[PDB]
Amino acid sequence: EDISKRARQLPVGEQLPLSRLLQYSDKQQLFTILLQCVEKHPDLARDIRGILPAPSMDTCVETLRKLLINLNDSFPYGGDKRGDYAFNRIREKYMAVLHALNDMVPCYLPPYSTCFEKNITFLDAATNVVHELPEFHNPNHNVYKSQAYYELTGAWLVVLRQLEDRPVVPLLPLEELEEHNKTSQNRMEEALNYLKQLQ
Amino acid sequence: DISKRARQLPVGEQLPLSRLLQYSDKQQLFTILLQCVEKHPDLARDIRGILPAPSMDTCVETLRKLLINLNDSFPYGGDKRGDYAFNRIREKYMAVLHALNDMVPCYLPPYSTCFEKNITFLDAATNVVHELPEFHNPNHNVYKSQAYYELTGAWLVVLRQLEDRPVVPLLPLEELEEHNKTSQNRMEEALNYLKQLQ
């Protein structure tokens, strides 16, 4: 009767909706496509940020532990662990441990994280994680471990340095860093020194 | 050079985006990504043409699993037609219909011209709808009652695109029969047209 004369509306054959197609795409692909949606729309990163909770320090530490375990077990069957061939096999996994450290550690550094007691706890965990890295016969493969010690040293410094201007200082981990630097073949010297200095 | 650079000391930041999204499974990624398209519609175009489309068989597989998932959701050994059972299953029930609603249109005119294919799908969709669960309360049967109505219209459009077009394929006249007989006859409109066209 009214404006337009109607008669049983027959369905229209439309295209598969967005939700349905995303179902047939997994974690990798989703994640990967999502990372580019943000690259195109930076503002998205803030929303998601306010949507996803930051994993707890313990969660993070638990991740690195799992990450280095993956490495130890990725070593080939019955061969030399310090071997070159044994290296190529674990490379990927190795990089994974390292890439995590680069990600996580900055969360517990000077401007961003001002909590001294926290940051140390993570540096300690982190350094121990680095103590475990695999050595090799070839001097090239070991460069990633020493490099790790170096950068690692930089962080302990910056972390301690926030104590400089800060009145009221705790009882810094002299014994922990002492052993830390020892296991490290003295690479952490500079940090051990500043520790004692400030202390 | 121009700046007096010393040994670089690390600077603190918030763990990168790639890291944060590592502590979330396909569910959340799926969801949050969905909201991104809602706020930035232009994102759908980019994600569309680059995503792997599910084949007919896969879609069909999805439905089976769904209703097979909905059949196990029924409480212990209670009355599978009581109201209580309905609740514990409304959701898994609805999932079946949503999936039907999404996928079915994907095989009608405008979009799908290939008659010999659409019939194939609708056939498998009607069977899914036969399988739906009946209940004592009459209010919980409108969903399945309505389903039958919709697919009726759905076969109509499919059969209609076989009009002005040359020749007349071998219509599933013998198929819709067992379908309309099973659907307690509320699918006759589409079948009366079958014998008609045919």
Curated annotation (Swiss-Prot), chain B:
Gene Ontology MF terms in the entry? identical protein binding; proteasome binding; sterol binding
Where primarily located?
nucleus
Q: Which domain of life is it from?
A: Eukaryota
The GO annotation for biological process reads: nuclear protein quality control by the ubiquitin-proteasome system; proteasome localization
Task: Tell me which GO cellular component terms the UniProt record holds.
Answer: chromatin; nuclear envelope; nuclear periphery; nucleus
**Which keywords, in A-to-Z order, does the entry hold?**
Nucleus, Ubl conjugation
Q: How is it modified after translation?
A: The N-terminal part (residues 1 to 72) is polyubiquitinated by rhp6, which is required for the interaction with the proteasome.
Q: Could you tell me where this protein is found in the cell?
A: Nucleus envelope
Its function, per the record, reads: Together with nucleoporin alm1, tethers the proteasome to the nuclear envelope. Involved in ubiquitin-mediated protein degradation and facilitates the degradation of nuclear proteins like mitotic cyclin and cut2. Required for normal progression of anaphase.
Q: What is stated as this protein's family in its record?
A: Belongs to the cut8/STS1 family.
| Subunit | Binds the proteasome.
Q: What is this protein called?
A: Tethering factor for nuclear proteasome cut8
